[PDB]
């Protein structure tokens, strides 16, 4: 098929941001011309996800962050204080999973531990 | 300090399930001898997480699932229909983190694509 | 006979744990002073099994789980995802079964969980 | 799904043998027409196991033995010398588990003790 105007506006906003965006950040980024209700943002994000055009991950707090499917950024996160840093590059280096008759689009990879302040 | 009786009962239940459980599923799994209130389950889970004895991740739905920290099971999930399969083996088994005094506990690795039924 | 220090340390650890333990979990759980190589853990477990003091079962993927012989817990296991529930009671309690001396039984159920059933 | 030619060849060989077979025994049983690599045998057995079309049980040594899912044979085994005898019939007589939202396929039932030679 082809993208409706709301799906196109969300993909444009996700591409324009250098980072991931929460549903609320994405909602606040829309100007009058592109404006839609918050529930409409989430519905249209879900459709973009089902078409494999948007990726999602959750912070430890449960907040969802969205990005274009091609943005493959991974983090180290302290399980105590939640402090987080981005990895320089993806350590899988584009290698394929071993290969079950499943068409692969992307991976989320997140590392968890204790920062200097929190380590026992 | 050593693990109290409630912390031990939760670790036992998470080990016995062979996979992961939400806080509500963990609560429903406890036998008469291990049973405690739901708020007690959440408080004790949070403590186990902070001690690095339990790992947590979020499903695409935003539900939080818990497992023993050493249970390292990854999935393929269809972004269209939400069908999921567990991988028999971790494809990044033994990975080190690249580069200042951060103690690694675990990684979350999840693959997303289209299943046989959904692939265009 | 009587148990050597290594056999006693493994039986103590299996009794102290509220559930079954893999050989690797048992190995990691030992006190520093009683610690031994993983192959030594397996050799000593095999001796405890031969004396009828420890029971063993295998997960579908081949991992061995050990417990005191007296712990008679049975499971429902999904053959797809490996999700498991313990049965609250033994469903063959009181079952009947020359010169074979019976010590214990393993009883394990396999199927599809709600998520995996097509 | 449906069975590929390798899955069909393994099911045929397991049905043709009067009892259970290790992956290596199954591999050695295949004729020129049905032959495949050992790793292919294990991969295809694992798939059949996950689909509930073959049953698996482990000898005390850890060796995996496979059979058609409907073949329900149980044993008496000496824990000392490993000598084993088959039970003349299943004493559960097809009775169902008590009955959560779980579809039951089969049971493994194994008895353990000391043979005449072994009790000290
Ligand atoms: Zn921290
Ligand atoms: Zn990556
Ligand atoms: Zn690199
Ligand atoms: Zn699908
Ligand atoms: Zn892993
Ligand atoms: Zn399952
Ligand atoms: Zn029993
Ligand atoms: Zn014997
Ligand atoms: Zn039977």
Author numbering:
A (entry chain BBB), B (entry chain AAA), D (entry chain DDD): 6 to 104, 108 to 128
C (entry chain CCC): 6 to 102, 108 to 128
Reported in the publication:
The structure was solved to a resolution of 2.1 Å employing single-wavelength anomalous diffraction with fluorescence detected at the zinc K absorption edge (9,666 eV). This approach was necessary because molecular replacement using a range of bacterial Fur-family proteins failed—indicating that SynZur adopts a structure that substantially differs from previously determined structures. The asymmetric unit of the crystal with the space group P65 contains four protein molecules. Interface analysis by PISA36 is consistent with SynZur forming a homodimer, with two dimers present in the asymmetric unit. Each monomer has two zinc ions bound with bond lengths that are within the expected ranges; one is bound tetrahedrally by four Cys residues (83, 86, 123 and 126) and corresponds to the structural site mentioned previously (site 1). Site 1 is located in the DD and tethers the C terminus to a region close to the second zinc site, which is formed by D77, H79, C95 and H115 (site 2). To confirm that this tetrahedral site is involved in zinc sensing, we generated a Cys95Ala mutant protein. However, electrophoretic mobility shift assay (EMSA) experiments demonstrate that the mutant is unable to interact with Zur boxes. Although some Fur-family proteins harbor additional metal-binding sites in an analogous location, SynZur is the first Fur-family protein in which this site is the sole sensory site. Thus, SynZur not only harbors a new zinc-sensing site, but also displays a unique orientation of DD and DBD.
SynZur (SYNW2401) is a metallosensor of the Fur family that responds to zinc, and hence a confirmed Zur protein. Using Synechococcus sp. WH8102 as a model we show that its zinc-sensor protein Zur differs from all other known bacterial Zur proteins in overall structure and the location of its sensory zinc site. Thus, Zur in WH8102 regulates both zinc uptake (via znuABC) and storage (via bmtA). Although homologs for the zinc excess sensor SmtB are absent from true marine strains, homologs of the ‘zinc uptake regulator’ Zur were found in every genome inspected, including a range of Synechococcus and Prochlorococcus strains, Trichodesmium erythraeum and Crocosphaera watsonii. These putative bacterial Zur proteins are members of a larger family of metal and peroxide sensors that also comprise Fur (ferric iron uptake regulator), Mur (sensing Mn2+), Nur (sensing Ni2+), Irr (sensing heme) and PerR (sensing peroxide).
